[PDB]
Design a protein around this ligand. Structure first.
Ligand SMILES: CCCCCCCCCCCCCCCCCC(=O)OC[C@H](COP(=O)(O)O[C@@H]1[C@H](O)[C@H](O)[C@@H](O)[C@H](O)[C@H]1O)OC(=O)CCCCCCCCCCCCCCCCC
Ligand SMILES: CCCCCCCCCCCCCCCCCC(=O)OC[C@H](COP(=O)(O)O[C@@H]1[C@H](O)[C@H](O)[C@@H](O)[C@H](O)[C@H]1O)OC(=O)CCCCCCCCCCCCCCCCC
Ligand SMILES: CCCCCCCCCCCCCC(=O)OC[C@@H](O)COP(=O)(O)O
Ligand SMILES: CCCCCCCCCCCCCC(=O)OC[C@H](O)COP(=O)(O)O
Ligand code: NA
Ligand code: NA
Lengths: 303, 294, 295, 305
């Protein structure tokens, strides 16, 4: 394995895996049979166990964080002499520890790899997500000690993001790894396109309705936007208010909006999701292989 | 040579504007020199021009939305000056769109049978303009239907932003895909559903005795409620022979679901490579429009 | 006496390759020629007349009073009664045509409910119209139910005339094929699951509004249309069992609805394009034969 | 020779009851002599025998349903038998249903012992046997609780009733369309529903915990309440305003919008598409698995004389 796994300066694994999202063929090169076998071998040797241990630790940490937050009480609040309070505060100090740990992990990531500042928002989505969670937790701490009530919003954002972050650990399993890859591809392509078009349609139709509406609760653009959105989730009322003239034009706008959005653009989202799944099978598999390779190399460098 | 600018007739000019009846409108655009020259001219000036046009139109739509939203007819404050200037600007923009629509109609003189198959965006812009002008006429005649004509114009204007996707590739292809369903499998797939809905609404309203759902409008709307995930199944109790009522409702629900299902199996039984060709064709049309319009 | 065009078009379903034999150059050419010459214009007129009949019947049914009822001498009421008379004449005509078809083509009891779908639909709508009349003259009230059933089947049979245009005829062919193939199995399995979970839930419920098998079944089915409640009763014991059962039913019913909405595409993303077009061609050929035999 | 009539080690029986590990236990049965033999024996006697079994099963399940739905509701079981024709019918229906439960329990115990399975693929293969054993176990524990003077006999009975009513799909085999429909159902539950449910449960628990943390207190201060409220979206009955006993409406609505966009918009339509590809990919596999299931039915009946 000369210049294959350990050169300490520049070797094939480090350049292939850590190459930025610019190389034309950064995915199919790992499919070389000896290299595939080598990665799988190192995995089975120790990386599988280290990843399982890390996953168990992360799940336990997030359970602790959920327990501490779910029982949250002008902070800070006095530490009452009761077992529940001691356990709550001990959970809080563990959560803060996790946040600071991820804050340093992201810093070390960005310093050791030092992306070119351009493809920093094109790859390494997991690391930026973890850094953002860490920042949310830190800002929650800062507001908590500053005697403000926005620390709840900060930490709930942190908690939701951290819970959704367990998708990171789906890698290391063939089936769930490919599933997570497909989810991410679909988010990037189909969700984005449909969301842009649908946002334009919804804003236009809500503006038309609110202009028609004379006064009342839905005279606000926000109220009318919420009402028109409630159609896409199978909850459209179609008669939320009668405070306006010319029932005809109101119903015409509502029916045109429903036909163009609910029956046409949703059917279009589903169809693109079908086409993509039928198209990017092997691409998803290669991306999963590369994700596992990056994890293996990192944990190998972590001793 | 006589392909880019002949000043009398060029291949790009004739291929761009050849009617829909021609068999291979977008296929021959794939010729190497045509593709390369179209791309060269686009990336030379049309991209910048199109970006500027899209920005101007978006700003205009924001202005018109603000003016219409804060409507106090007909009808010394900074807010009052902003509203009135917004109204004036919106009217002027509608007039300009009227002008451009008339100009295109006269120039291409479509055959009134593909006039609707082609120039879909042009027809949409013209109809927007006709709504705005009628809204002006009603407003200055001391009437109220100006609000209906304004809201329709505003809705079409905001939903017409999709014409500007051309210039962004993936957004252009997605927009081309939506166009296909509306101008091919929308009328046809909607006539069947409409006849089902009308027939079952007539059956139900006949079955009812009397109530707040005596009219055809209310019963038709109730039967439509199911299509939007709001099936009530009990809206009226004033009747006789409950079993016939409920079995008819179940029949309608199952049939409408199967109809939607057949819609999906039919249309999902798209193009991908043809859509890219369509988008390239529309981008080329934009390129020549910018070139001649300078 | 015996022509390949009339023999094959009316050939049984026992023949293997009807959908193919219409591809023969002379046959398809001649069928298109006859259509475009005369049968297109005859079919257009026939569709016009049928739609006018349906409008008349709809108007008559809508304004029904609240039998027989006395006629008050007003022009609108004379209009109503003559509408009802035209509606009965058309129903009788459809009944006569159905009986004539059954006494001419003698369907051999095997594909009788597989092919000739439109003819059977019209015949059953005739059986509804005539039984409605019989109830009406007998001083009975069920005539309203029979009449509404007939009206629903008529407006739905409107689709029979969708043929003569390729795209709409092919979509209608897809609807018929779906109804005869896939909704069958989907509804069998869905009914089994719905009844099982309905019985479980109603057994769990002690008493109340939703204590009957019928009300429980309705509340359960309400989930398939995205109008679930998940809390429609509380007069019982073991809320845990209630929630477990409702969650299991919701999960399984979505599995089933999905499995269908996918399996139909998976099986027939392919055959629809060509087989449905061939079937539409066959249906147009049969229409040509019927029109010609009607002179 | 020694294909189906060997009595020492027959290839047909060996392959039909073979280990799961066998690479192509489904493909080998397609051999023309094997398939011809299976079809012959089926048509000759197993068709009639299996249809009679289906009829008896349906009759048993109707009797049990009628007995349960008409149960006496008075508390503290058992209940004294009151002299009435209807009551005599309702108690004999009960005693027949109990007998059926015991019969299925013994059938399962027999399959378990006779087969001597691997204890590793035992769950992976033979889902039907374990499911029937489970309904029988529920029924027997329902009898025990009924005699033990408790109120959980009804819970055990309703679970058994639901499981048995859904178990009629075991008989879908023997009809090509519904057999292949059931096998596709089974594959799709094992793969696509499992993946989607893993991701969806993670997402739902995370966002529901976040919301219930945000919610100050009131009706929805319980984790279960917020979990149900969030699950109401995926069934197409979300509210978006079910609670207002909190602060910072901005964060609340942002969390709800994120949850909706991530689950309802994205993961459900991904389920659509993934199930589309799957079904478009695994047709012949389902056909072969159904053929093997009918083969196992035929062999079991033949050994049952
Ligand atoms: C902030 C917004 C982020 C939005 C991005 C979408 C979420 C998804 O990010 O990426 C999935 C996963 C993988 O990332 P990775 O960098 O490690 O992989 C990359 C990746 O494959 C890429 O092709 C190559 O660069 C190379 O293959 C490999 O290097 O990352 C996760 O673990 C998050 C998944 C869990 C979060 C999903 C929630 C939805 C995302 C939007 C909301 C985010 C906040 C919650
Ligand atoms: C432990 C619990 C795991 C639950 C997973 C779901 C199991 C399931 O669903 O498989 C239906 C089953 C028939 O599999 P089979 O054993 O016959 O198939 C196998 C299989 O194919 C194998 O590959 C071949 O070796 C060969 O074919 C054969 O070995 O049972 C039925 O006959 C349908 C009955 C359908 C009802 C069962 C599902 C009900 C869901 C919950 C119901 C809630 C009720 C309350
Ligand atoms: C009075 C009768 C009702 C008239 C319609 C009222 C105005 C509501 C909006 C009508 C929707 C028309 C269809 C539409 O606006 O979407 C199509 C475009 O996105 C397609 O993209 P593009 O314009 O071709 O570039
Ligand atoms: C005999 C039981 C009591 C009467 C209840 C009957 C419930 C049916 C209600 C009438 C509508 C049935 C129409 C139908 O069966 O679905 C649509 C047609 O298939 C479409 O076929 P086609 O296009 O007309 O050829
Ligand atoms: Na709903
Ligand atoms: Na719904």
């Amino acid at each position: 394995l000369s210049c294959i796994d350990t050169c300490e300066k520049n070797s094939v694994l480090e350049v292939i895996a850590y190459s930025s999202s610019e190389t034309p063929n950064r995915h199919d090169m790992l499919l070389v049979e000896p290299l595939n076998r080598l990665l799988q071998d190192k995995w089975d040797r120790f990386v599988k166990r280290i990843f399982y241990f890390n996953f168990f630790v992360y799940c336990l940490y997030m359970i602790i964080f959920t327990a501490a937050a779910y029982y949250r009480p002008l902070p800070p609040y006095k530490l009452k002499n009761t077992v529940g309070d001691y356990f709550r505060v001990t959970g809080e100090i563990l959560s803060v520890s996790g946040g600071v740990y991820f804050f340093f992990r992201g810093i070390q990531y960005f310093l050791q790899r030092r992306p070119s500042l351009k493809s920093l928002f094109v790859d390494s989505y997991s690391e930026i997500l973890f850094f953002v969670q860490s920042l949310f937790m830190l800002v929650s701490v800062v507001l908590y000690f500053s005697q403000r009530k926005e620390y709840v919003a900060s930490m709930v954002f942190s908690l939701a993001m951290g819970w959704t972050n367990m998708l990171y650990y789906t890698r290391g399993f063939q089936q769930m790894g490919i599933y997570a890859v497909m989810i991410e591809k679909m988010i990037l392509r189909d969700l984005c396109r449909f969301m842009f078009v649908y946002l334009v349609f919804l804003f236009g139709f809500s503006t038309a309705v609110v202009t028609l509406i004379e006064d009342g609760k839905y005279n606000s653009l926000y109220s009318t936007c919420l009402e028109l959105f409630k159609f896409t989730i199978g909850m459209g009322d179609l008669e939320f208010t009668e405070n306006y003239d010319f029932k005809a034009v109101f119903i015409i706008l509502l029916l045109a909006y429903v036909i163009l959005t609910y029956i046409l653009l949703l059917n279009m989202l589903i169809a693109l999701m079908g086409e993509t799944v039928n198209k990017i099978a092997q691409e998803s598999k290669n991306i999963w292989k590369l994700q596992r390779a990056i994890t293996i190399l990192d944990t190998e460098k972590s001793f």
